Amino acid sequence: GINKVLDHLAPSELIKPVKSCHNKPSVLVLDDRIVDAATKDLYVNGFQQNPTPENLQHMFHQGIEILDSARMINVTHLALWKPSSFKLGNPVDFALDDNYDTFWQSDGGQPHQLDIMFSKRMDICVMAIFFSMIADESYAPSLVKVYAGHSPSDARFYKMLEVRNVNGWVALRFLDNREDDQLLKCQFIRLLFPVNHENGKDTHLRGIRLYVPSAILR
Amino acid sequence: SLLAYYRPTKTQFFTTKTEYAQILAQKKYFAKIMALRTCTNGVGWGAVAYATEKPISTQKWVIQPLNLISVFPDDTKITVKAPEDIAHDIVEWGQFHAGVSSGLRISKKATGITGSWIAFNKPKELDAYHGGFLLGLGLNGHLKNLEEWHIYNYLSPRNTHISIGLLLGMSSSMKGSMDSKLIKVISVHLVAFLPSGSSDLNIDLKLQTAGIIGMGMLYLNSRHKRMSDSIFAQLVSLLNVNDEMVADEEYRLAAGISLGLINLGAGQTKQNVMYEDLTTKLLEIVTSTYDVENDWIPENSQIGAVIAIMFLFLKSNNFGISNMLKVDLKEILKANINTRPELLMYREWASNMILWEFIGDDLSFIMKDVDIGVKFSELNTDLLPIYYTMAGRILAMGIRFASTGNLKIRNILLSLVDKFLPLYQYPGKQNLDFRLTISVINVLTNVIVVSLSMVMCASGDLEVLRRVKYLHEVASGPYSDLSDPTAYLEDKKDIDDHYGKFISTNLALGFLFLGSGQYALNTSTLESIAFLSMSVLPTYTTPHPLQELKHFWSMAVEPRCLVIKDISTGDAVNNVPIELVVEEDVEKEEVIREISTPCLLPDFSKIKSIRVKMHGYFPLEVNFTKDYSASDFFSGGTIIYIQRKSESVFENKASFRNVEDIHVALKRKAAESKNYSRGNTTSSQLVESLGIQDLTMVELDTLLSAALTDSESYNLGLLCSDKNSGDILDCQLELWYKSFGPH
């Protein structure tokens, strides 16, 4: 029994198939001009001239409602946030206020950092980000890399996101890490924005949300 | 040859490719990995050479610079250059490590090393080598009173390495003197202890960690409330770096070890109220569960709180505190679990060290209450706590049986390392859950090798060397066989993983051959366990926290080597069998242990008697009673001298009392012929030729020459009728000849 549980803990010959990983970091396509079943799963607002900002606000609200329509638990306000730097005009509150008009802006080094620190082991399943290519082209995020880990010490690369034209909410469920659970299990998530569109300098963040599974008398 | 650092390093490369460009890239990658190895050989070279070279004072010291140039079997040399090939900080970090090794090489009892000597050896240009060298002299106990003249000269540049070396070495030299003139200097260095509201002065974070560890170690056994409460506040509070608030895991680990070392041995209480208040506050920190992350109590202080509770009740056998500290696997695997998993290793290690009488030597203690209990036996994050569980238990087990050696523990670790070795550094299916679990595997296998080295220290074992050699060689990882800054970070993570893997194997190689094998670690004195536990702290993951503390085990190394010397000649005699009486590390009665002469005997307090027996020198057997111990007996010196018997003709007057075995006679004849090959030339043969071999017979022959008065006649009769003597029968015949022979 002792030997067998060690073997289950440490499978020597059982696991390693050929040891032939390609080792390149996998790249995710975010374009919204091609219609596919997989993209529809990750892209919610639907594929479509540039819409007017009031149309962007309208579709911003509809995407929030659609994402919240399904059986879900929102724990966006259940974690600590620490961006790389402020600009004294708008903290991350306007990023997490679920309002298109307001937004958060960083100001500092080019490799902008957004830190998400958790208090308890929460199993995130759907990662939601809203982008606005036409509304914020100057500060649009063009290159996104999402990390993972249990602590600031052991942060590791998870996925790439290249932005070409996404004027809507982006849903990011995770399946590569754990196929059995179809969800991510970490306590430490950080985001990087190393470069912007048309050689930008800073970056806004219109929306951000975290998803987890589980008449009257006045 | 494997562990030396001042020379090109022999490398082995796989390169399972045929294209020339791909082969060159892998060779360059292996060259970068070998540069990491050359940087980290500081930890190993410190242990290989503890007290080898002695100083002459007048002679000027020299520090060999890092070579970090690799040589392949094809002899196509590839040279690593900074910061193009490797991270820039790594090269002078290795220089600092090599300097610490160089400083510690000087012996403890060496005299003439005053404040002027270090200034005389100053290179006139501050670098990592001199800071490390300065740290080594300070750590050995030489900076007892360093003059204030050139303290400012050293500290005037803001270079971190020299400042770190100066702070740590000097604090280690006084080691608990509570002197004002030096504690005030670090107080100036530490930003948080500086008076509130003062304008911030730029001080590096690593420098702050270096200063705080020196203060705690400076305040060893002080039991000083005014500093301990401030230190406790330091662990809980938040820091300021670059005018913005920052929370550091590195600084809090330093604060935790600081609090533990200052109040070492203060927990054996049956001050008590204040100790109870501090104990319950630390337990509150370690046990508090927060659904929402508080800013000023993050999880980074959990290890410090846990490490602090380690030193409060060290070697106290307080079952209750251990139970509230010890974590049960069956309960936690049922639940989702909380906090960083790495805390579990430290918690169980702390709980096991508290009960310093039941550290199990069997696999059952290691394998206690562990079961996978899930259908999915594939590597998943859910079974990380058991790996950290395993790591803590074996680390406590290894430190408990430190340098005493054993066979069952060695065999268990051999089985464990054989089982866990193949999984090591295998990025087969690149999945984040799998990658995190196998990173824990890398940490676990680093711990098993280090612990296996700890139990078998100073013995030069074969299989432990076999395992540590393998961990040393072959980089493995994603490359070989088994957006620019983004690629830089991707390569930085892998290179740091290799650096962490290399420090562990180097520590094992150094510990195996400690002081050329004639020095061993001490775990008798209470603070020795503190330094040993402090130095073995597993910090192999990024960013390798508190690495500069790795060269502190030198406080625990002490001689314990027994050799035999002759008295008359005054020279050493070797290769004589020695029988030893021990307690078998248990309550059993005794087992005879036969060893050669230059062998490391076990701890003196556990030895009851020692005897030397060998053909030739007459035997010497000493039994140690309760009154005098082996340590007190060897206090004057670890060498016991033996007297030389005598092959004298006068000893064998007439009869040979000796058995005179034919085998030993032939061996002696062959040995004498060997010297003769490489006769009446000896004085014994002269006295044999003269015929005065029998002392008593010649004297009585002279006496009887003439008379024979009555008194001497009765005297000769008494010697003849002696109860015990030698040539009695020969003596009887002469009186008969004198009395009734021809005349």
mmCIF file of N, CA and C in Angstrom, chain B residues 198-284:
data_model
loop_
_atom_site.group_PDB
_atom_site.id
_atom_site.type_symbol
_atom_site.label_atom_id
_atom_site.label_comp_id
_atom_site.label_asym_id
_atom_site.label_seq_id
_atom_site.Cartn_x
_atom_site.Cartn_y
_atom_site.Cartn_z
ATOM 1 N N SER B 198 10.217 60.780 8.712
ATOM 2 C CA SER B 198 11.462 61.201 8.090
ATOM 3 C C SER B 198 11.414 60.955 6.586
ATOM 4 N N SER B 199 12.054 61.849 5.836
ATOM 5 C CA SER B 199 12.147 61.680 4.392
ATOM 6 C C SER B 199 12.861 60.377 4.053
ATOM 7 N N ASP B 200 12.302 59.637 3.098
ATOM 8 C CA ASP B 200 12.834 58.322 2.767
ATOM 9 C C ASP B 200 14.210 58.451 2.125
ATOM 10 N N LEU B 201 15.151 57.637 2.593
ATOM 11 C CA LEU B 201 16.484 57.544 2.014
ATOM 12 C C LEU B 201 16.609 56.219 1.274
ATOM 13 N N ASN B 202 17.163 56.268 0.065
ATOM 14 C CA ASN B 202 17.177 55.097 -0.803
ATOM 15 C C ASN B 202 18.059 54.009 -0.202
ATOM 16 N N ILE B 203 17.447 52.884 0.157
ATOM 17 C CA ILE B 203 18.159 51.720 0.673
ATOM 18 C C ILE B 203 17.595 50.489 -0.022
ATOM 19 N N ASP B 204 18.474 49.671 -0.597
ATOM 20 C CA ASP B 204 18.016 48.506 -1.340
ATOM 21 C C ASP B 204 17.300 47.517 -0.427
ATOM 22 N N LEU B 205 16.280 46.867 -0.990
ATOM 23 C CA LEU B 205 15.475 45.916 -0.231
ATOM 24 C C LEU B 205 16.307 44.739 0.263
ATOM 25 N N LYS B 206 17.177 44.200 -0.594
ATOM 26 C CA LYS B 206 18.068 43.126 -0.164
ATOM 27 C C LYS B 206 19.007 43.590 0.944
ATOM 28 N N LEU B 207 19.451 44.849 0.886
ATOM 29 C CA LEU B 207 20.254 45.398 1.973
ATOM 30 C C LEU B 207 19.466 45.438 3.278
ATOM 31 N N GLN B 208 18.174 45.772 3.205
ATOM 32 C CA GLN B 208 17.339 45.775 4.403
ATOM 33 C C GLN B 208 17.192 44.373 4.979
ATOM 34 N N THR B 209 16.996 43.377 4.112
ATOM 35 C CA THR B 209 16.908 41.996 4.573
ATOM 36 C C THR B 209 18.218 41.561 5.212
ATOM 37 N N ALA B 210 19.338 41.940 4.600
ATOM 38 C CA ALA B 210 20.643 41.626 5.165
ATOM 39 C C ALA B 210 20.837 42.265 6.536
ATOM 40 N N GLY B 211 20.447 43.531 6.687
ATOM 41 C CA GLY B 211 20.585 44.183 7.980
ATOM 42 C C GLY B 211 19.748 43.549 9.076
ATOM 43 N N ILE B 212 18.506 43.184 8.755
ATOM 44 C CA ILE B 212 17.600 42.625 9.757
ATOM 45 C C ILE B 212 18.019 41.227 10.198
ATOM 46 N N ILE B 213 18.536 40.408 9.284
ATOM 47 C CA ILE B 213 18.988 39.086 9.704
ATOM 48 C C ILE B 213 20.203 39.212 10.610
ATOM 49 N N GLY B 214 21.091 40.160 10.318
ATOM 50 C CA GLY B 214 22.208 40.395 11.213
ATOM 51 C C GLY B 214 21.791 40.865 12.597
ATOM 52 N N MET B 215 20.793 41.757 12.680
ATOM 53 C CA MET B 215 20.311 42.193 13.994
ATOM 54 C C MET B 215 19.731 41.056 14.818
ATOM 55 N N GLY B 216 18.875 40.229 14.214
ATOM 56 C CA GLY B 216 18.333 39.118 14.972
ATOM 57 C C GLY B 216 19.416 38.176 15.443
ATOM 58 N N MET B 217 20.346 37.846 14.551
ATOM 59 C CA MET B 217 21.467 37.003 14.929
ATOM 60 C C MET B 217 22.400 37.753 15.875
ATOM 61 N N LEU B 218 22.444 39.090 15.764
ATOM 62 C CA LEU B 218 23.187 39.905 16.725
ATOM 63 C C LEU B 218 22.563 39.803 18.105
ATOM 64 N N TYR B 219 21.234 39.763 18.163
ATOM 65 C CA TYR B 219 20.479 39.688 19.406
ATOM 66 C C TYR B 219 20.168 38.253 19.801
ATOM 67 N N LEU B 220 21.063 37.322 19.483
ATOM 68 C CA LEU B 220 20.879 35.934 19.876
ATOM 69 C C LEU B 220 20.829 35.796 21.391
ATOM 70 N N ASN B 221 19.847 35.026 21.861
ATOM 71 C CA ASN B 221 19.638 34.709 23.274
ATOM 72 C C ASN B 221 19.524 35.973 24.134
ATOM 73 N N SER B 222 19.252 37.130 23.523
ATOM 74 C CA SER B 222 19.174 38.352 24.315
ATOM 75 C C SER B 222 17.878 38.424 25.113
ATOM 76 N N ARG B 223 16.788 37.876 24.569
ATOM 77 C CA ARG B 223 15.468 37.913 25.204
ATOM 78 C C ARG B 223 15.050 39.350 25.512
ATOM 79 N N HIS B 224 15.352 40.262 24.592
ATOM 80 C CA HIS B 224 15.154 41.692 24.811
ATOM 81 C C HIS B 224 13.794 42.110 24.254
ATOM 82 N N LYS B 225 12.884 42.516 25.143
ATOM 83 C CA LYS B 225 11.528 42.873 24.728
ATOM 84 C C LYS B 225 11.511 44.074 23.787
ATOM 85 N N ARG B 226 12.270 45.125 24.109
ATOM 86 C CA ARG B 226 12.175 46.354 23.326
ATOM 87 C C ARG B 226 12.553 46.126 21.864
ATOM 88 N N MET B 227 13.363 45.111 21.573
ATOM 89 C CA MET B 227 13.702 44.811 20.187
ATOM 90 C C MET B 227 12.775 43.764 19.586
ATOM 91 N N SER B 228 12.381 42.753 20.368
ATOM 92 C CA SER B 228 11.555 41.679 19.823
ATOM 93 C C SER B 228 10.176 42.176 19.407
ATOM 94 N N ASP B 229 9.549 43.032 20.218
ATOM 95 C CA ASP B 229 8.244 43.557 19.832
ATOM 96 C C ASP B 229 8.349 44.415 18.578
ATOM 97 N N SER B 230 9.417 45.209 18.473
ATOM 98 C CA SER B 230 9.650 45.981 17.259
ATOM 99 C C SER B 230 9.865 45.063 16.063
ATOM 100 N N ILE B 231 10.606 43.969 16.262
ATOM 101 C CA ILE B 231 10.835 43.006 15.187
ATOM 102 C C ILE B 231 9.516 42.359 14.780
ATOM 103 N N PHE B 232 8.672 42.036 15.764
ATOM 104 C CA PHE B 232 7.364 41.454 15.477
ATOM 105 C C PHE B 232 6.523 42.420 14.656
ATOM 106 N N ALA B 233 6.527 43.695 15.045
ATOM 107 C CA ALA B 233 5.824 44.717 14.280
ATOM 108 C C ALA B 233 6.374 44.795 12.862
ATOM 109 N N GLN B 234 7.688 44.607 12.711
ATOM 110 C CA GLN B 234 8.307 44.607 11.390
ATOM 111 C C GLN B 234 7.756 43.499 10.505
ATOM 112 N N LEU B 235 7.577 42.301 11.064
ATOM 113 C CA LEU B 235 6.993 41.204 10.300
ATOM 114 C C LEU B 235 5.568 41.517 9.855
ATOM 115 N N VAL B 236 4.757 42.078 10.754
ATOM 116 C CA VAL B 236 3.370 42.393 10.422
ATOM 117 C C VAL B 236 3.249 43.613 9.513
ATOM 118 N N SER B 237 4.114 44.611 9.678
ATOM 119 C CA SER B 237 3.892 45.902 9.034
ATOM 120 C C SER B 237 4.211 45.841 7.540
ATOM 121 N N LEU B 238 4.153 47.003 6.892
ATOM 122 C CA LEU B 238 4.361 47.152 5.461
ATOM 123 C C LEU B 238 5.538 48.093 5.237
ATOM 124 N N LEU B 239 6.208 47.950 4.098
ATOM 125 C CA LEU B 239 7.433 48.694 3.838
ATOM 126 C C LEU B 239 7.189 49.745 2.753
ATOM 127 N N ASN B 240 8.215 50.556 2.499
ATOM 128 C CA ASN B 240 8.192 51.599 1.479
ATOM 129 C C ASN B 240 9.422 51.427 0.599
ATOM 130 N N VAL B 241 9.208 51.276 -0.706
ATOM 131 C CA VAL B 241 10.297 51.186 -1.676
ATOM 132 C C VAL B 241 9.950 52.045 -2.884
ATOM 133 N N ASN B 242 10.882 52.918 -3.277
ATOM 134 C CA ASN B 242 10.699 53.825 -4.413
ATOM 135 C C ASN B 242 9.440 54.676 -4.258
ATOM 136 N N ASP B 243 9.214 55.157 -3.036
ATOM 137 C CA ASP B 243 8.121 56.056 -2.672
ATOM 138 C C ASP B 243 6.743 55.429 -2.840
ATOM 139 N N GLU B 244 6.666 54.114 -3.025
ATOM 140 C CA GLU B 244 5.396 53.419 -3.169
ATOM 141 C C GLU B 244 5.371 52.213 -2.242
ATOM 142 N N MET B 245 4.208 51.959 -1.644
ATOM 143 C CA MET B 245 4.085 50.879 -0.675
ATOM 144 C C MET B 245 4.286 49.532 -1.358
ATOM 145 N N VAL B 246 5.049 48.657 -0.711
ATOM 146 C CA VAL B 246 5.334 47.330 -1.244
ATOM 147 C C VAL B 246 5.370 46.334 -0.093
ATOM 148 N N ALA B 247 4.904 45.118 -0.358
ATOM 149 C CA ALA B 247 4.940 44.025 0.604
ATOM 150 C C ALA B 247 5.903 42.975 0.073
ATOM 151 N N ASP B 248 6.915 42.644 0.866
ATOM 152 C CA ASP B 248 7.965 41.734 0.438
ATOM 153 C C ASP B 248 7.895 40.426 1.212
ATOM 154 N N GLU B 249 7.896 39.315 0.476
ATOM 155 C CA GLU B 249 8.049 38.009 1.104
ATOM 156 C C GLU B 249 9.464 37.843 1.645
ATOM 157 N N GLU B 250 10.453 38.372 0.917
ATOM 158 C CA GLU B 250 11.851 38.254 1.320
ATOM 159 C C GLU B 250 12.087 38.905 2.674
ATOM 160 N N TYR B 251 11.589 40.130 2.842
ATOM 161 C CA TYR B 251 11.813 40.877 4.073
ATOM 162 C C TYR B 251 11.102 40.226 5.254
ATOM 163 N N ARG B 252 9.901 39.691 5.020
ATOM 164 C CA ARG B 252 9.137 39.044 6.084
ATOM 165 C C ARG B 252 9.751 37.712 6.498
ATOM 166 N N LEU B 253 10.327 36.967 5.550
ATOM 167 C CA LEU B 253 11.068 35.768 5.930
ATOM 168 C C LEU B 253 12.241 36.134 6.823
ATOM 169 N N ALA B 254 12.943 37.212 6.478
ATOM 170 C CA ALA B 254 14.048 37.683 7.301
ATOM 171 C C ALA B 254 13.559 38.099 8.682
ATOM 172 N N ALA B 255 12.412 38.779 8.742
ATOM 173 C CA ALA B 255 11.847 39.167 10.030
ATOM 174 C C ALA B 255 11.456 37.950 10.862
ATOM 175 N N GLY B 256 10.892 36.920 10.224
ATOM 176 C CA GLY B 256 10.516 35.725 10.966
ATOM 177 C C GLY B 256 11.709 35.012 11.573
ATOM 178 N N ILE B 257 12.758 34.808 10.776
ATOM 179 C CA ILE B 257 13.964 34.166 11.289
ATOM 180 C C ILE B 257 14.627 35.058 12.331
ATOM 181 N N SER B 258 14.549 36.377 12.142
ATOM 182 C CA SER B 258 15.081 37.309 13.130
ATOM 183 C C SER B 258 14.398 37.124 14.480
ATOM 184 N N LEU B 259 13.061 37.133 14.500
ATOM 185 C CA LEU B 259 12.354 36.984 15.768
ATOM 186 C C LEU B 259 12.654 35.643 16.415
ATOM 187 N N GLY B 260 12.705 34.582 15.613
ATOM 188 C CA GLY B 260 13.015 33.273 16.156
ATOM 189 C C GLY B 260 14.405 33.168 16.755
ATOM 190 N N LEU B 261 15.395 33.792 16.116
ATOM 191 C CA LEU B 261 16.764 33.664 16.602
ATOM 192 C C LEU B 261 17.037 34.508 17.842
ATOM 193 N N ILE B 262 16.401 35.674 17.962
ATOM 194 C CA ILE B 262 16.614 36.526 19.132
ATOM 195 C C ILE B 262 16.139 35.845 20.409
ATOM 196 N N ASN B 263 14.939 35.271 20.371
ATOM 197 C CA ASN B 263 14.324 34.597 21.508
ATOM 198 C C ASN B 263 14.470 33.076 21.484
ATOM 199 N N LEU B 264 15.597 32.570 20.989
ATOM 200 C CA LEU B 264 15.836 31.132 20.978
ATOM 201 C C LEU B 264 15.844 30.567 22.390
ATOM 202 N N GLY B 265 15.153 29.444 22.573
ATOM 203 C CA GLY B 265 15.101 28.811 23.874
ATOM 204 C C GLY B 265 14.294 29.535 24.923
ATOM 205 N N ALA B 266 13.332 30.362 24.523
ATOM 206 C CA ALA B 266 12.497 31.080 25.473
ATOM 207 C C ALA B 266 11.111 30.465 25.621
ATOM 208 N N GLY B 267 10.866 29.313 25.000
ATOM 209 C CA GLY B 267 9.561 28.692 25.018
ATOM 210 C C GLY B 267 9.385 27.531 25.970
ATOM 211 N N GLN B 268 10.435 27.116 26.676
ATOM 212 C CA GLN B 268 10.336 25.988 27.595
ATOM 213 C C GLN B 268 9.655 26.356 28.905
ATOM 214 N N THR B 269 9.004 27.514 28.954
ATOM 215 C CA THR B 269 8.273 27.928 30.141
ATOM 216 C C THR B 269 7.117 26.972 30.412
ATOM 217 N N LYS B 270 6.867 26.705 31.689
ATOM 218 C CA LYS B 270 5.800 25.790 32.076
ATOM 219 C C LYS B 270 4.431 26.415 31.825
ATOM 220 N N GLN B 271 7.422 37.511 32.044
ATOM 221 C CA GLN B 271 7.971 37.057 30.772
ATOM 222 C C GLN B 271 7.111 35.949 30.174
ATOM 223 N N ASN B 272 6.635 35.040 31.032
ATOM 224 C CA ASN B 272 5.747 33.978 30.569
ATOM 225 C C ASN B 272 4.457 34.551 30.003
ATOM 226 N N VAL B 273 3.902 35.573 30.656
ATOM 227 C CA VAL B 273 2.673 36.180 30.158
ATOM 228 C C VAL B 273 2.942 36.811 28.801
ATOM 229 N N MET B 274 4.047 37.551 28.708
ATOM 230 C CA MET B 274 4.413 38.220 27.470
ATOM 231 C C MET B 274 4.811 37.225 26.388
ATOM 232 N N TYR B 275 5.457 36.121 26.770
ATOM 233 C CA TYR B 275 5.743 35.062 25.808
ATOM 234 C C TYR B 275 4.461 34.395 25.332
ATOM 235 N N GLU B 276 3.505 34.190 26.243
ATOM 236 C CA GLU B 276 2.217 33.632 25.848
ATOM 237 C C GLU B 276 1.482 34.578 24.911
ATOM 238 N N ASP B 277 1.564 35.885 25.176
ATOM 239 C CA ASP B 277 0.929 36.853 24.290
ATOM 240 C C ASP B 277 1.561 36.818 22.904
ATOM 241 N N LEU B 278 2.894 36.777 22.842
ATOM 242 C CA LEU B 278 3.570 36.690 21.552
ATOM 243 C C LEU B 278 3.248 35.378 20.848
ATOM 244 N N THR B 279 3.193 34.278 21.602
ATOM 245 C CA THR B 279 2.879 32.984 21.006
ATOM 246 C C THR B 279 1.475 32.968 20.413
ATOM 247 N N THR B 280 0.494 33.487 21.154
ATOM 248 C CA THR B 280 -0.871 33.481 20.641
ATOM 249 C C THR B 280 -1.047 34.459 19.486
ATOM 250 N N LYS B 281 -0.295 35.564 19.479
ATOM 251 C CA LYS B 281 -0.319 36.458 18.327
ATOM 252 C C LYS B 281 0.239 35.789 17.074
ATOM 253 N N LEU B 282 1.360 35.072 17.202
ATOM 254 C CA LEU B 282 1.934 34.390 16.045
ATOM 255 C C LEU B 282 1.022 33.278 15.549
ATOM 256 N N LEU B 283 0.415 32.535 16.477
ATOM 257 C CA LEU B 283 -0.546 31.503 16.098
ATOM 258 C C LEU B 283 -1.771 32.110 15.434
ATOM 259 N N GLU B 284 -2.215 33.270 15.914
ATOM 260 C CA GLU B 284 -3.319 33.958 15.258
ATOM 261 C C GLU B 284 -2.949 34.309 13.822
#
